[PDB]
Amino acid sequence: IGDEPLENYLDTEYFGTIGIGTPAQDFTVIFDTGSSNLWVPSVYCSSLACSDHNQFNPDDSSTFEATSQELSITYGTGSMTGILGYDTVQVGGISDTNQIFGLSETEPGSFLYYAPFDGILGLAYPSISASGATPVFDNLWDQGLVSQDLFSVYLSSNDDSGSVVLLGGIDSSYYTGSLNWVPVSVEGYWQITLDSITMDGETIACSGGCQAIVDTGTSLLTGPTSAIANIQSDIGASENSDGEMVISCSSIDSLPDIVFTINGVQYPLSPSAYILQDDDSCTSGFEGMDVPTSSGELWILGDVFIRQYYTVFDRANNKVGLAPVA
Amino acid sequence: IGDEPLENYLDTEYFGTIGIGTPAQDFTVIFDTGSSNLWVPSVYCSSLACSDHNQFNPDDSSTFEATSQELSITYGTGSMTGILGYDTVQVGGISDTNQIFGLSETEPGSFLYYAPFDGILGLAYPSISASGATPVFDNLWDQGLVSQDLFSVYLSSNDDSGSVVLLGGIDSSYYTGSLNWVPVSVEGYWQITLDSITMDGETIACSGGCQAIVDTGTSLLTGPTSAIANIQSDIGASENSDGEMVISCSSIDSLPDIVFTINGVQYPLSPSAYILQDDDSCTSGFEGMDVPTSSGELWILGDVFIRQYYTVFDRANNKVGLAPVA
Numbered sequence: 001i002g003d004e005p006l007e008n009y010l011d012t013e014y015f016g017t018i019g020i021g022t023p024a025q026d027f028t029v030i031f032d033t034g035s036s037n038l039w040v041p042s043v044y045c046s047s048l049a050c051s052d053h054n055q056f057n058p059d060d061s062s063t064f065e066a067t068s069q070e071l072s073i074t075y076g077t078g079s080m081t082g083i084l085g086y087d088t089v090q091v092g093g094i095s096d097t098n099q100i101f102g103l104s105e106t107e108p109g110s111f112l113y114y115a116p117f118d119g120i121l122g123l124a125y126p127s128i129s130a131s132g133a134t135p136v137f138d139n140l141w142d143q144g145l146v147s148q149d150l151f152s153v154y155l156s157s158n159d160d161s162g163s164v165v166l167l168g169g170i171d172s173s174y175y176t177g178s179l180n181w182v183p184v185s186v187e188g189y190w191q192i193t194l195d196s197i198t199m200d201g202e203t204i205a206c207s208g209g210c211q212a213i214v215d216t217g218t219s220l221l222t223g224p225t226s227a228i229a230n231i232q233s234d235i236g237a238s239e240n241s242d243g244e245m246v247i248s249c250s251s252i253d254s255l256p257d258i259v260f261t262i263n264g265v266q267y268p269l270s271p272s273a274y275i276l277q278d279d280d281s282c283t284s285g286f287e288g289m290d291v292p293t294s295s296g297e298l299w300i301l302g303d304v305f306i307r308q309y310y311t312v313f314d315r316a317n318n319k320v321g322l323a324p325v326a
Numbered sequence: 327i328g329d330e331p332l333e334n335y336l337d338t339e340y341f342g343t344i345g346i347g348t349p350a351q352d353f354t355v356i357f358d359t360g361s362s363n364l365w366v367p368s369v370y371c372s373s374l375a376c377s378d379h380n381q382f383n384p385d386d387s388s389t390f391e392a393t394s395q396e397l398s399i400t401y402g403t404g405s406m407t408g409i410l411g412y413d414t415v416q417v418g419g420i421s422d423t424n425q426i427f428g429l430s431e432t433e434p435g436s437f438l439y440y441a442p443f444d445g446i447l448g449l450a451y452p453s454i455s456a457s458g459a460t461p462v463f464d465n466l467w468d469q470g471l472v473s474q475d476l477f478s479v480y481l482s483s484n485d486d487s488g489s490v491v492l493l494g495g496i497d498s499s500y501y502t503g504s505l506n507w508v509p510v511s512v513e514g515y516w517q518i519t520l521d522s523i524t525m526d527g528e529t530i531a532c533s534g535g536c537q538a539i540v541d542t543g544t545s546l547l548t549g550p551t552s553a554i555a556n557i558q559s560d561i562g563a564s565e566n567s568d569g570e571m572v573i574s575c576s577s578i579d580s581l582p583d584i585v586f587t588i589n590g591v592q593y594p595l596s597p598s599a600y601i602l603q604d605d606d607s608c609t610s611g612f613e614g615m616d617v618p619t620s621s622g623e624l625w626i627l628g629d630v631f632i633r634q635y636y637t638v639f640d641r642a643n644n645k646v647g648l649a650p651v652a
């Protein structure tokens with residue numbers, strides 16, 4: 001079981017440290033369950049986002065193996081094109097040997113240039129892995145490096161220390177009562193079926209269910225624009241400049257829980273979970289984002305939700321396990 | 327003995343993580359031996375750099391005690407003014423109970439905005455601490471949270487993992503041979519007497535001594551403008567724009583050791599250590615700054631130097647211990 005400590009930056013991005021190579025070059029990465037690929041900046045990248053960011057030099061690793069397999073990936077925020085090579089990756093105190101990972105050649109856009117992390121470590125299923133590159137957890141299970149075929153995430157609140165990715169195990173100290181398991185409906189993302197979303201008993205969205213992914217890599221709780229636009233009204237948040245659906249911080253103590261019913265069990269987010277507040281200003285935890293898939297237009301249950309529910313991702317049986325954090 | 331790992335960001339910045347408060351809030355701080363104050367942003371800070379960095383909120387800490395004292399600190403690059411407060415800083419494993427530190431109120435200048443860290447933990451002598459704020463090492467020793475009255479720094483080269491600050495102990499495995507102990511000359515900074523800087527038999531600089539400090543929070547080897555000017559010429563580096571006193575990377579195999587004799591022992595610097603090379607670009611490790619003190623113009627032996635020499639800063643007997651990295 002590996003323990004990968006995570007830095008909670010503004011409750012928006014949780015990232016940890018990995019080493020790639022021999023000797024090991026260090027990089028901080030986002031641990032993303034919305035994707036399956038590991039990749040970091042390389043000395044071959046010309047994009048501006050690579051200049052101010054730690055870059056992987058293959059000519060300094062006695063263990064590196066090159067391949068000619070090119071790679072291309074687009075996220076909701078940012079993309080990269082690169083090439084796939086091979087090496088040891090130290091992640092969560094484990095020596096992942098012979099891991100295929102992406103070395104970037106371009107990271108188009110201004111977004112990532114600003115970001116306090118170098119790369120992305122995907123944790124979704126191999127089916128969505130661009131260029132078929134073996135996911136890290138997959139390569140660990142395959143090598144017998146993790147004791148169990150599950151990892152779990154605890155994401156801290158209020159910029160506190162202690163967020164963790166526990167690879168190969170759960171730790172009951174992080175949750176209250178017991179885990180509820182939900183089947184993955186469609187296996188690629190950790191896609192689970194959302195039964196409904198209510199406030200004060202009335203369905204306000206997702207009537208007759210909708211598809212949801214549990215994404216550690218999304219900050220907010222994102223959903224199909226039109227739906228979210230309602231919720232925003234149902235809590236009185238309004239637009240400021242570029243996505244700032246601003247809400248008065250006085251409102252927090254008046255609003256009601258918004259309940260997510262997944263597999264018959266209700267998972268409420270209180271107003272103090274779904275309103276993010278910096279110092280003296282509040283914002284909405286909900287973001288509109290149409291993400292069309294073959295299995296429907298997704299509802300992404302980001303850090304805003306994961307912050308309240310210790311999440312376990314069982315690959316052995318394709319189930320998500322949720323329980324309230326301690 | 328505290329073990330504090332630092333992320334080597336581009337061989338220019340080495341920062342680690344601390345927690346302030348119960349429950350503890352995360353912050354990444356530069357461990358700077360060139361000052362003595364610990365500060366972090368706080369929710370009082372209005373400044374630009376304070377918006378995109380984590381901010382200490384006293385209201386979410388059950389162990390916070392506030393003070394009336396004001397704090398102002400000008401650094402070589404940057405500054406702050408703030409208010410002082412007390413709380414439990416968990417640094418390197420240790421829970422430094424009831425520690426005074428600065429909650430900033432302004433952090434003027436866009437460079438701090440763009441920087442991948444929140445605060446600075448100063449590691450020098452109390453004489454130079456702003457407002458006579460107890461430096462953390464001092465507060466650990468007074469409470470007996472460290473065994474030995476010394477700390478050691480190992481700074482990895484090449485963006486590798488493994489840079490570490492070892493609080494209250496030296497670790498033999500990081501150096502070659504045995505420590506050479508230099509006395510501190512004047513006690514404020516970790517100030518020592520540099521006897522000469524020669525290059526192929528000839529004194530290129532600082533004949534008949536000059537004052538130097540070993541300063542982990544300074545990226546390059548710094549010295550008085552006019553002196554460094556000659557060294558830049560003698561190695562070939564020339565300005566491009568906002569410095570970028572750039573050198574043809576081809577020159578790394580022609581150039582010789584510049585040598586720093588400290589208390590009669592010679593400490594050479596290979597081209598490989600004094601020309602910085604990100605990617606396929608080599609720039610010069612020397613920077614020209616006139617740093618007037620009551621004990622002369624200071625030479626700063628920063629990161630460029632410390633990456634080649636494991637350094638013990640011993641407060642028990644006012645002495646610095648150097649030995650080559652193994």
Ligand SMILES: CCOC(=O)N[C@@H](CC(C)C)C(=O)N[C@@H](CC(C)C)C(=O)N[C@@H](CC1CCCCC1)[C@@H](O)[C@@H](O)CC(C)C
Pocket residue numbers: 012013014030032033034035074075076077078115120189213215216217218219220222287289291300
């Ligand atoms: C206040 C707004 O917050 C953000 O923009 N946050 C970023 C991530 C932050 C950790 C830097 C985000 O949520 N981006 C989403 C965009 C989403 C709302 C459409 C995203 O692309 N997340 C990536 C992961 C991110 C990519 C940017 C770098 C960090 C990892 C991945 O999970 C998805 O592409 C999965 C797909 C099913 C939607």
Ligand SMILES: CCOC(=O)N[C@@H](CC(C)C)C(=O)N[C@@H](CC(C)C)C(=O)N[C@@H](CC1CCCCC1)[C@@H](O)[C@@H](O)CC(C)C
Pocket residue numbers: 338339356358359360361400401402403404446515541542543544545546548615617626
């Ligand atoms: C390649 C260019 O690199 C830098 O300019 N690096 C910065 C530090 C980096 C961590 C941003 C530097 O060397 N800053 C020196 C600049 C000075 C040599 C012209 C400095 O102010 N360092 C601070 C600590 C820094 C200050 C900015 C915040 C990070 C800690 C401290 O050591 C001095 O105040 C000591 C004094 C005797 C000069």
